[PDB]
């Protein structure tokens, strides 16, 4: 019962991340405004979820099979495109980019990218590196390439408009993001909070 | 002597990319024949900056699109309506902007 | 849906390149242990600007 | 349920709730549905909506 053995505990689950909010007309004036979501895919980044509550009780993690999911809360009459991709290198910050087309293109260039209208649903797969490197579970520290295994950027390609042609300006909510994940934790512990 | 090779070999490679968004002009900003030209995007490999095909272009001297095909990915429902014409002119110097007769342009 | 692929494939490619010239320091400019370090050239692929690798 | 009174014990060897909508695709609202196996687990006591979800 007092075993000093370490082993990966690969356990599965699902979680609710947050509700997206298409930026609309007013709040959309430049490129960086078109970045709705910048959410690290570190296990311990989603506070109340089960994944993070578990992560708090280990040192390390590694997404063996993760996939962000979009579930719309709108009709099919509204119109706006969305692009989503998970950059496996956190320190790649597109916010510095001004040219919007350059932004969408460096997004599409990432392999796991996805484009979808905010009236249907699609899945954003996380692509896993090939070296077996484990990542630390605690809050982000001096460097990020240790903790974060990826970063989910959600983009607004077009402008938001309604049944009629008038474009909305009220910055409404379109859907919700879920995470159907499979992770492997290595070292039992407790992280400070 | 350290003689670099002398084989001028061709490297053919394929893949899709992304030019830009199309912005229809509406009734306000459509007051002329030039306003009806929404996209003027050269097809030189070195014209697509953010892409990596253009970057590779700098690693060679000459190019030739053995096959190219622009694809339109819409974002609207079937409720809205507007006709569009798209043609890849093989002569860049042919400028439609100089035209005034909209029908001639079309 | 326009879903870009999900295949993280490896692309191995080979070729030679050119780092820089070596400048021996002579008797005048060799007055210390640091002066005897002629080349400090990182080997990160992104360190060779002019090259295409 | 009526038959249930004719026996003492039961066990759902298989159950599956099915949602039969009545609206078009014009309206939109997200829904979550989960069969909790512990009846005493009451979500009403919660205040943090995100925790509930």
């Amino acid at each position: 019962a007092r075993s000093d053995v370490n082993a990966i505990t690969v356990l599965n689950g699902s979680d609710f991340l947050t509700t997206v909010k298409v930026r609309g007309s007013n709040n959309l004036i430049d490129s960086k405004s078109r970045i709705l979501v910048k959410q690290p895919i570190s296990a311990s980044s989603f506070l109340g979820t089960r994944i993070s509550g578990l992560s708090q009780f280990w040192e390390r993690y590694r997404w063996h099979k993760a996939a962000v999911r979009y579930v719309p809360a709108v009709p099919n009459t509204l119109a706006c495109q969305l692009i989503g991709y998970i950059d496996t290198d956190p320190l790649d910050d597109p916010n510095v980019i001004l040219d919007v087309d350059q932004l969408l293109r460096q997004a599409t260039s990432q392999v796991g990218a996805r484009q979808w209208n905010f009236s249907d649903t699609t899945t954003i797969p996380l692509i896993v590196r090939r070296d077996d490197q484990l990542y630390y579970t605690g809050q982000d520290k001096e460097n990020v390439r240790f903790s974060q295994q990826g970063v989910f950027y959600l983009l607004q390609v077009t402008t938001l408009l309604n049944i009629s042609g008038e474009a909305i300006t009220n910055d409404l909510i379109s859907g919700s993001l879920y995470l159907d994940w499979v992770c492997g934790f290595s070292m039992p512990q407790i992280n400070p909070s | 002597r350290s003689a670099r090779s002398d084989v001028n070999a061709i490297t053919v490679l394929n893949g899709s990319d992304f030019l830009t968004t199309v912005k229809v002009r509406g009734s306000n900003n459509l007051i002329d024949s030039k306003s009806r030209i929404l996209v003027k995007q050269p097809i030189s490999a070195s014209s697509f900056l953010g892409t990596r095909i253009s970057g590779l272009s700098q690693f060679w001297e000459r190019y030739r699109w053995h096959k190219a095909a622009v694809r339109y990915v819409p974002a609207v429902p079937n409720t809205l309506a507007c006709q569009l014409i798209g043609y890849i002119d093989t002569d860049p110097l042919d400028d439609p902007n100089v035209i005034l007769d909209v029908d001639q342009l079309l | 849906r326009s879903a870009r692929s999900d295949v993280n494939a490896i692309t191995v490619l080979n070729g030679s390149d050119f780092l820089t010239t070596v400048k021996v320091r002579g008797s005048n400019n060799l007055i210390d242990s640091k002066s005897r370090i002629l080349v400090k050239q990182p080997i990160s692929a992104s360190s060779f600007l002019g090259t295409r690798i | 349920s009526g038959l249930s009174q004719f026996w003492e014990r039961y066990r759902w060897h298989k159950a599956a709730v099915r949602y039969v909508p009545a609206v078009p695709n014009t309206l939109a609202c997200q829904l979550i549905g989960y069969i909790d196996t512990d009846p005493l687990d009451d979500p009403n006591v919660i205040l943090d909506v995100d925790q509930l979800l």
Binding site: - | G15 | - | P24, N25
Partner: peptide, 21 residues
Amino acid sequence: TVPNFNPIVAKPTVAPLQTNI
């Protein structure tokens, strides 16, 4: 030659009204 450089795929989906049962 380098195959599958930037391959993109498209799969159109309809969006009717009043899915009936």
